Design a protein around this nucleic acid. Structure first.
Lengths: 153, 5, 215, 249
RNA sequence: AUUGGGCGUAAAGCAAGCGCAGGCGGAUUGAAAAGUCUGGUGUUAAAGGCAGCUGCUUAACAGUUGUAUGCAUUGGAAAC
RNA sequence: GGCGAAGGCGAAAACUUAGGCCAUUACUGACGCUUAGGCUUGAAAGUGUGGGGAGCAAAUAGGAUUAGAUACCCUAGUAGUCCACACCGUAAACGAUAGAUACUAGCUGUCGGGGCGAUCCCCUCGGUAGUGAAGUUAACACAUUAAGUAUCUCGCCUGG
RNA sequence: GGUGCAUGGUUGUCGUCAGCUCGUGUCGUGAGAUGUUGGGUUAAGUCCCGCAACGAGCGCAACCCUUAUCGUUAGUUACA
């Protein structure tokens, strides 16, 4: 639970006689052991928006599984024309990634990883693509169970 | 879910 | 462009602050300017005294300046070193033939009096404290004091130019348009090093139904 | 044992060619009637599953909720079920968010009960106009919250007589992980409803029948007698706004 | 953008058809072995890149040993 | 609604003539898709020669409104719009969606062939539309006639 | 003396116009939408039905003053 923000954005919708300046923030929540969630919310002030985003993220959490501190098979995250790639790095290289990717992977209790940004660079789409790529990970024990070759095959 | 509790 | 809430419900739900009378248009101006010097003198000299309001009682060369404050020790001082000084200052600023015999009385639940809250906001703003946290803390303390919603709006240089960026807060039923609301109002002029900061605090202390007239 | 196949004299039939095609499992190949008939053995199996689940839920001493919104018959039906068995129920339009958000409605039901007791203790202290105004608001609140008033936590089980017409209720129930059982007619989407009951709900005779078996199933777990379930023959004969004419236009 | 992009509205499907050369291409059997894989031999100068060691008071560096990559010949495999 | 590959095709007849769909116990036996170059067709405007000119109408003249009006309006008005032989080869030549093939829920019409047969309706194989999920898309939206899952080939794009 | 293009406070205008927003939740990759829309009645977002919305604040009315009837306490420096 570090709750490190990634990108706060200054948004505003027009209105008769003035500009409704109601900026929004994005947060990442992770227990450094497998719990990951994200949440985007808007408010008139920084603390209100931060609190709302943390509540939204922590309310909707979802788990991930760890094998030697890294992803074990290469996977590409296709979501909203903004691709993010993961690769099973060897134990020594350590964490390397962009801003939002490093935030997500570090808060995921992870370790060494290889990533490369593809497509656009808007943080929300990167977060969505990375999360999709990390949750379509199909566990080796799962495919072992759903196959007749469960005995280490 | 099989059964409640 | 709205009328002051204190002056709208004045004389129909709130008693007058300076009750007195004299000969017609002869020297009431003199008393009006002289007694007011006490009212401003308290609020200027004793910031930390947390004086809420003072009542003036004049009739044919006699004066009774009632005082309501949360910390009377500052007014009294140590072993009554300050009460004599304050009473002699009031005498020197009012004259010589009028008996004074002032009193100092405690206020019940001070944290729901607008004047001292505005004074504390001005002190916090002039102390380079960021406006948001201090205003939120004061809001929390006044709400916890056991009153109704609050309406604090502050204008001035909010740590920079482009002053027209005032901040306002509302956290409960505050019907300004209702005469039968018993709404207390006060204003303070925080004086920061960059300019003038105006703080306004509206406090609701419950409805005033069945009160008949001024208490 | 439990509503033998003879008693389901009118339990199959729906409007022609409006069925969701992903339910090809339950419906046999189409015939002249063009109303998608259902297999009764799997129907009895589904009834057994629902019975043994709601019985255990009631043994857990939780809270279950009932839903009925169609025009007259199902509303009177759920009212009768509520007055017969101590069950939470909803008779008017679903208020769009009863379960997904609960703090904004618990305050409302608390206000309802507080004003009910305020009326109960007020000996005409206020004016008659003031008395009339409060009672009108009481009537308003009972019109919407007369059912869900004796609950404290989120309902751990809810029933729906028509998931298509109650897509809001089933969607809200599926936002959470709580179970839901529905009279899944041949036009619904089974991916949402947990326990599928492929029965007929447009016709009057079948909805009351299955609602009564479920009500007795939850009642028997409370020791109460079973009016329409497990009871055998020459019974289960329900008064009928006659059940005929399946096709709709 | 072979791995590693696109062509409805953002640049981009020729106005359409007949079409040779080119690319691609039904199922089964036989052979050959041009593609394909693999074993042996020859060669792919030295310096340099990589790894280890030694010597400069230690590195920069120098020396030291192994190291890839392709090509040609020869012997087999027959799934495409 | 039908046909054609596209442009397009609607008073009636005769001759010549093209392609398409359904069923095939028939036949050749991979002879099939795409296509650089090439060839053919290709709305209207326009041009060369000879006719034709009822209506309409660029250019032009006059009468109106406007400050101006060489425009919108009105009255005249030639080339042209028509036909015969050639030339020009451009259009938002639009489904803004290249061709060929296999697979992928369903519902509502409509048109043709076939079986059954008073029409209506039963269904089979096709062509043309609407609604609609998984799926795709940046969204609009497409969605068995794909902008879906894939292959083959060609053409084309690389800021204004 | 200057800077109302550094201000507080005060004030004009839309305008006594009926609007302006927030909390929770839902939908949307998003700015955002949903309440505030649709149907009736009012000067009024005033109320009532329906409705993925449920509630809340500012804003309207109401509590205030004055005129319009009567009862009562009081009778002068009114009245008679």
């Amino acid at each position: 639970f570090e709750e490190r923000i990634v990108k706060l954005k200054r948004i505003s919708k027009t209105t008769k006689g003035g500009r409704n300046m109601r900026f929004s923030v994005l947060v990442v929540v992770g227990n450094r052991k497998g719990k990951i969630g994200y949440g985007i919310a808007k408010a008139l002030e920084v603390p209100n928006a931060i609190k709302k985003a943390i509540k939204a993220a922590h309310n909707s959490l979802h788990t991930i599984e760890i094998h030697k501190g890294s992803i074990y098979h290469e996977v590409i995250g296709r979501s909203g024309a903004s691709r993010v790639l993961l690769k099973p790095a060897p134990q020594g290289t350590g964490i390397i990634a962009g801003g939002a990717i490093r935030a997500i992977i570090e808060l995921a209790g992870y370790s060494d990883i290889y990533t490369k940004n593809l497509g656009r660079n808007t943080p929300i789409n990167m977060i969505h693509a990375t999360m999709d790529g990390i949750l379509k990970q199909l566990s080796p024990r799962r495919v072992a169970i759903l196959r007749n070759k469960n005995l280490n095959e | 879910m099989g059964n409640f509790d | 462009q709205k009328v002051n809430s204190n002056g709208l419900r004045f004389g129909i739900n709130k008693n007058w602050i300076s009750r007195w009378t004299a000969n017609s248009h002869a020297q009431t101006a003199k008393w009006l300017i002289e007694d007011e010097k006490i009212r401003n003198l308290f609020f200027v000299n004793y910031r930390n005294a947390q004086v809420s309001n003072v009542e003036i009682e004049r009739t044919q060369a006699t004066v009774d300046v009632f005082v309501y404050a949360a910390q009377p020790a500052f007014l009294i001082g140590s072993e009554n070193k300050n009460i004599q000084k304050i009473t002699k200052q009031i005498k020197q600023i009012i004259g010589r033939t009028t008996n004074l015999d002032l009193t100092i009385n405690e206020i019940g639940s001070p944290m729901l009096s607008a004047r001292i809250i505005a004074r504390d906001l001005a002190n916090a703003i002039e102390a380079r404290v960021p406006l948001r946290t201090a205003m939120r803390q004061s809001l929390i303390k006044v709400l916890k004091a056991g009153a109704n919603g609050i309406k604090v709006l502050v204008s001035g240089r909010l740590n920079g130019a482009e002053i027209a960026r005032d901040k306002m807060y509302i956290e409960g039923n505050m019907p300004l348009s209702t005469l039968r609301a018993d709404i207390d109002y006060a204003l303070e002029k925080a004086q920061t090093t960059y300019g003038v900061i105006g703080v306004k605090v509206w406090i609701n202390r419950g409805m005033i139904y069945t009160k008949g007239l001024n208490r | 044992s439990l509503a033998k196949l003879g008693e389901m004299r009118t339990h199959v039939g729906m409007v022609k060619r409006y069925w969701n095609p992903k339910m090809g499992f339950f419906i046999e190949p189409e015939r002249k009637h063009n109303n998608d008939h259902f297999v009764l053995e799997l129907q009895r199996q589904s009834l057994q599953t629902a019975y043994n689940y709601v019985k255990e839920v009631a043994q857990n001493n939780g809270q279950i909720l009932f839903v009925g919104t169609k025009n007259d018959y199902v509303k009177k039906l759920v009212n009768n079920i509520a007055k017969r068995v101590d069950v939470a129920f909803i008779t008017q339009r679903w208020l769009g968010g009863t379960l997904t958000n609960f703090k904004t409605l618990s305050i409302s039901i608390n206000k309802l009960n507080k004003l009910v007791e305020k009326q109960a203790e007020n000996a005409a202290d206020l004016t008659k106009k003031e008395n009339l105004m409060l009672s009108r608001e009481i009537e308003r609140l009972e019109k919407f919250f007369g059912g869900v008033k004796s609950l404290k936590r989120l309902p751990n089980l809810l029933i729906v007589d028509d998931p298509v017409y109650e897509k809001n209720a089933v969607a809200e129930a599926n936002i959470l992980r709580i179970p839901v059982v529905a009279l899944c007619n041949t036009n619904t989407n089974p991916e949402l409803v947990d326990f599928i009951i492929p029965a007929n709900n447009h016709q009057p005779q079948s909805t009351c029948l299955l609602m009564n078996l479920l009500a007795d199933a939850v009642a028997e777990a409370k020791a109460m007698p079973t009016m329409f379930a497990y009871k055998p023959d020459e019974e289960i004969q329900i008064e009928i706004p006659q059940k005929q004419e399946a096709p709709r236009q």
